[PDB]
Amino acid sequence: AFSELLDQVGGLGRFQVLQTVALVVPIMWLCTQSMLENFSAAVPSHRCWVPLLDNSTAQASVPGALGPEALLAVSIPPGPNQGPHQCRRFRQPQWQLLDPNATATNWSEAATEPCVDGWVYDRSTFTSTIVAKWDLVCDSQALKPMAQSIYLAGILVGAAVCGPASDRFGRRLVLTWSYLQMAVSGTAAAFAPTFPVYCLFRFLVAFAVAGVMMNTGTLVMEWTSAQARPLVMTLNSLGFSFGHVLMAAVAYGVRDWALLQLVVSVPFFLCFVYSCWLAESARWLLITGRLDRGLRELQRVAAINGKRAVGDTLTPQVLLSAMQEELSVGQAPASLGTLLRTPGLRLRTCISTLCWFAFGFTFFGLALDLQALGSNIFLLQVLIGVVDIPAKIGTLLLLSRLGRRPTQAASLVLAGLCILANTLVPHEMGALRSALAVLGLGGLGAAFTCITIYSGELFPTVLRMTAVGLGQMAARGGAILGPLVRLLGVHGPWLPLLVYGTVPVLSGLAALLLPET
Ligand SMILES: O=C(O)CSc1nnc(Br)n1-c1ccc(C2CC2)c2ccccc12
């Protein structure tokens, strides 16, 4: 509402605290939904099915007993990197390779049989997985990143439909609808019998995620005081930061792809239930002509804040007079035609969108394939969640006592360089490998928070929202494009990481040209 009304009702008080907690608690269970891919779509070791071992009759037919290690060679070509071929097998058994004296070079995949009877996955760490369920290996390997991209695509669609809709129906209504949509879509995805059905439900879940994010952010921004809008927006982000730790904790308990999804998505039903008691933003109600509901909402907030006499004295006449400043000046959003046309503003917007896209691309291309960064995924997730908090908190202090531009450049460049170095280190040493990956991810989070604080300040007041929205769209597009880099993994696992580490470095170096403050 207007400053005078929000002051007579109370800037920061009990109701603020309550609504912020209510709206931040779901953010953890939404970061869990976003990061569920790491655990529900893990890729375990997958040898090729062979009748000799799986079928006990053939194995028992041979007199005596033969060790599995020796009997696997006679039916699996020696694959690259001194290991069994994951997608090939021997068409017929070859006892010649059984003798260790003979060199195994002659035994190769020249006359190997492509997997016909299916794959045998390991269940030591994951009882079941999407990859092990729908055989997303070998020829279908590329289908794994695609499912991650489509989900991200949904987010881009959600922000494209939850913007105007929320501006015509409200924030509380769309928030409740998105909560229920997320709950139902996540519950239904657990029972998907085919890959396309699961992908469609994941896309709907992403739609709901975008809706929830935008609506909760807008409600928090509107119901908070002017001097603390970015602060509580960064609190919204810190909720996701702790959702990382929540995801790490939940995965270690349930080892499955359906039970994990169901447990992750079921709390959103309770979210929808209690979401019917939140407060619709009074600002939107007043500017959109809803006066009685706005008055009721303001009185409710004031009573909750402990001021009943102040609310009792409010009248529609004063309510309209307070909002006359906004009613008379009917600010309409400005199109990009008045933004990119000015030559003196092109470089700023270009660099801003470059930074937004670089983060949205590298971060979500790296975090989705968390297995490639380190040794085990649980420790990586826990450390990411633990470290992203202090980095984000310290970024604010750096901004306070240091310029915005140098902090942005340093954070982005250091994150990119750490990601690049993570690839160069020998693969045997996993400790520094995971440490460098964690430091790079924390630096990326710090850079994201810094750019979020920075983007609004460069552009004038009138054009700030257009530039912010353009940056968010660029970040979502980069997120969509991020997983597609892993498609360039057939050449080697190093190329995707090299791309992911080279992009942030160049973006940071470019981010030193835009003016300070
Ligand atoms: O705007 C807000 O309310 C803050 S959202 C936030 N917090 N940490 C992070 Br990473 N992000 C996020 C930042 C950016 C994105 C988009 C895809 C490019 C995200 C997409 C899904 C989930 C979190 C996201």
Distance 167 CA to ligand 1 centre (A): 21
Residue type, 311: G
What 3-state DSSP class applies to 177?
helix
**Rounded Cα–Cα distance for residues 225 and 228 (Å):** 6
User: What kind and span of H or E run contains 29?
Assistant: helix 14-35
Count CA within 13 A, CB hemisphere, residue 127. 10
Q: Give the number of the atom of ligand 1 that is nearest the alpha carbon of residue 217.
A: 3
- The torsion region of residue 246 among left (phi > 0), alpha (psi -120 to 50) and beta comes to alpha
Cα–Cα dist 472/485, whole Å? 20
Nearest CA to ligand 1 atom 14: 360
Residue with structure tokens 């470059």? 354
How distant is the alpha carbon of residue 463 from its chain centre?
28
Helix (H) or strand (E) segment spanning residue 83: strand 83-84
Could you tell me if residue 12 is left (phi over 0), alpha (psi between -120 and 50 degrees) or otherwise beta?
Answer: beta
- 498: tokens are 């090299």
Residue with tokens 């970040």, as numbered in its chain: 475
Token representation of residue 231:
């602060």
What is the pairing mode between strands 78-79 and 46-48? unpaired
- Taking the centre of ligand 1 as the mean of its atom positions, its distance from the CA of residue 403, in whole angstroms, is 24
Question: How many angstroms separate the CA atoms of 245 and 446, rounded?
Answer: 17
Note the resolution in Å, 1 decimal: 2.7
Cα–Cα distance measured from residue 129 to residue 149, given in angstroms and rounded to the nearest whole number? 18
Which residue, by CA, sits nearest to atom 18 of ligand 1?
A: 476
SS3 494: helix
The alpha carbon of 246 is separated from its chain's Cα centroid by a whole number of angstroms, namely: 14
> Is the separation of the CB atoms in 457 and 234 below 8 Å?
no
Distant-in-sequence, close-in-space partners of 23: CB < 8 Å, separation ≥ 6:
216, 219, 220, 236, 278
Pocket test for ligand 1, best of 149, 182, 214, 240 (most atoms within 8 A of CB): 240
Protein residue with least CA distance to atom 13, ligand 1: 360
Nearest residue by C-alpha to atom 11 in ligand 1? 237
d(CA 157, CA 176): 18
What region, left, alpha or beta, does residue 118 occupy, with left being phi > 0 and alpha being psi -120 to 50 degrees? left
Query: Are 472 and 356 contacting, i.e. CB atoms less than 8 angstroms apart?
Result: yes
Write phi, then psi, for 94 (nearest 5 degrees): -130, 100
CATH architecture for segment(s) 1-41+135-331: Up-down Bundle (1.20)
Q: Is 111 exposed, middle or buried (0-12, 13-18, 19+ CB in 10 A)?
A: exposed
Q: What angle do CA 290, 469, 445 make, to 5 degrees?
A: 120
Structure tokens, 38: 């790491």
User: Which residues are within 8 A (CB) of 414 and not within 5 positions of it... i.e. 6 or more apart?
Assistant: 443
Exp. method: cryo-EM
Residues in contact with ligand 1 (CB, 6 Å cut-off): 34, 155, 213, 217, 236-237, 240, 360, 363-364, 475-476, 479
The token duo for 27 is 């953010």
Task: Give me the DSSP letters along 91-105.
Answer: SS--GGGGSTTS-SS
In the reported structure, the alpha carbon of residue 217 is separated from the centroid of ligand 1 by a whole-number distance in angstroms of: 11
CA 125 to chain centre: 24
Q: Which atom of ligand 1 is nearest to the CA of 216?
A: 3
Name the phi and psi angles at 247, rounded to 5. Answer: -60, -45
The residue whose two tokens read 């970024």 is 395
Between the CA of 286 and the centroid of ligand 1 the distance, in Å, is 29
Whether 378 contacts 248, CB under 8 Å: yes
Same CATH topology for 1-41+135-331 and 334-517: the answer is yes
How far is the centre of ligand 1, averaged over its atoms, from the C-alpha of 239 (Å)?
Answer: 11
Quote the distance between the C-alpha of residue 180 and its chain's center. Answer: 20
User: How many whole angstroms from its chain centre is CA 261?
Assistant: 16
* Fold topology of 334-517: Growth Hormone; Chain: A; (1.20.1250)
Calculate the CA dihedral of residues 451, 455, 458, 464 and round it to 10 degrees: 180
Q: Which two tokens stand for residue 193?
A: 């019998």
Q: Which residue is closest in CA terms to ligand 1's atom 12?
A: 237
The answer to whether 199 touches 277, Cβ cutoff 8 Å, is no
Q: Using alpha carbons, select from 104, 45, 101, 116 the residue that is nearest to residue 74.
A: 104
Which of 229, 235, 237, 363 to probe ligand 1 with, by most ligand atoms within 8 A of CB? 237
Atom of ligand 1 nearest to the CA of 367: 10
- Residue 79 Cα to ligand 1 midpoint, Å, equals 40
- Total residues found in the chain within this entry: 517
* b/e sequence 403-432, b meaning 16+ C-beta within 10 Å: ebbebbbbbbbbbbbbbbbbbeeeeeeeee
The residues that bridge with 391 in the sheet, in sequence order, are: none
What residues does 46 pair with on adjacent strands? 121
Give 205-236 as a DSSP string. HHHHHHHHHHHHHHHHHHHS-GGGHHHHHHHH
Q: Where are the alpha helices (DSSP H) in 135-266?
A: 143-169, 172-189, 195-223, 229-253, 258-265
Which atom of ligand 1 is closest in space to residue 360's alpha carbon? 18
CA distance 166 to 178: 11
Mark out the alpha helices in 425-493 (DSSP H runs).
431-458, 464-481
CA dist 499 → 484, 488, 494 (Å): 11, 10, 9
How far apart are the C-alpha atoms of 363 and 370, rounded to whole Å? 11
Cα dihedral 475→477→480→485 (10° resolution): -90
Report which ligand 1 atom has the smallest distance to the Cα of 236: 3
Rg of the chain in Å (alpha carbons) = 27
Extents of the domains making up the chain? 1-41+135-331, 46-121, 334-517
Tokens of 215: 């609506």
To the nearest 10°, report the CA torsion of 468, 469, 470, 471. Answer: 50
